[PDB]
Amino acid sequence: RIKKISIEGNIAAGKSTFVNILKQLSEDWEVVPEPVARWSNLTMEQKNGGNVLQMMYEKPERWSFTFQTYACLSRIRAQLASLNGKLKDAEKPVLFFERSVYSDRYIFASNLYESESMNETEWTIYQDWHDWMNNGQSLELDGIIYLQATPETCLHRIYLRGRNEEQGIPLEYLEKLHYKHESWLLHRTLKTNFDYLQEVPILTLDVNEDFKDKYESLVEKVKEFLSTL
């Protein structure tokens, strides 16, 4: 009975921030972090995650396939966990996901292939591994929230977070990611392998303005979104 809502957005758009605000607004609202976020910070996954992250930074064209498969698994099992042992005693439970299996593939893994960091064989193996691994069924989303921010807004926010590894993210890379989110979540010109996705409710939220201490209007839009469902 738990509603599934994905929080989607570019690097630095404000997802963790938005999700961390949402968790604290209700005992019926819970939050599944992106494992790449937990990696971007020992469990076996955390060691594995860290090593593959740096490996991928150092040579994306060697390690993209490995990164992507482990990113996605780590995400499916973290979502399935939270779904299985959370919120059973909520009247209105909603699980918010920081990104989804659909970002993993149609944004990130697609972008890496489009940049030849995966060859055709790695990409095809990846989509097949995804089309099947996701059959993970109980993960169909009830809605998607798009946190929209210009490619430029993101780059400055990369400055505000200020992690050393992020300062060399090219505005060029954000921009490609941005067109992917827009075509998927705004234009809706993306034809995926998951029937329901062409018709799932999307809520588009302009986060170009700082919302850390001025989030009421955004949370209000989410509450209304949730009512429609």
Place this chain on the structure above:
Amino acid sequence: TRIKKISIEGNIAAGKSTFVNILKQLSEDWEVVPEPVARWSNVLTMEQKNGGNVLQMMYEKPERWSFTFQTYACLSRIRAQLASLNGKLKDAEKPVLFFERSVYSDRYIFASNLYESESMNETEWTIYQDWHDWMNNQFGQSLELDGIIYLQATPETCLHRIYLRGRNEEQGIPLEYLEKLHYKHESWLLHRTLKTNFDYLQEVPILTLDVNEDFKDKYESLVEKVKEFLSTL
């Protein structure tokens, strides 16, 4: 399930394919699941296409391709093993599904030997193990074995059998590598020293057949042991 699931294990060219095509024929209650990679070796579905490619890339550059190939081959197995388990033997009196090797073969024979050969690094191998644990648990519950049939031959006989099997892409296979795979088969199925992370495997009944002698024309005794073995499961 009501289906009896039995994996046939053994070294390369031990004669598993031979024996499996013999068993499928003998009883309407018997079905086989042939190995994905064994399929790829010859010669076009999506899987076959990826299959042929990653197998060729594997052979050229194993330090680069061992992780990717191992993931695909085990995914491909789990898929096909499900397909038979939910498809065939639906009206059979005493159903038997013979798996040509198992998810355990993937992990404890081939993936393992590649980590040991330095064809997968530590991170590759622990990510692989992580997934294998999880992939078989989320997806591979109904795949659990009722028994294993170990076709046990020596590397020399197997080497002998590759040279005779006239497959040029395989004429390169060296002996010490066959020794390495044999050694891991002995440790898993004969002595049962090899630890797996699969508790129930410790206790699965195991029939070992010495298959050094040729059996193509003359396999009746082997089958009688199988049928004897089956009657205890």
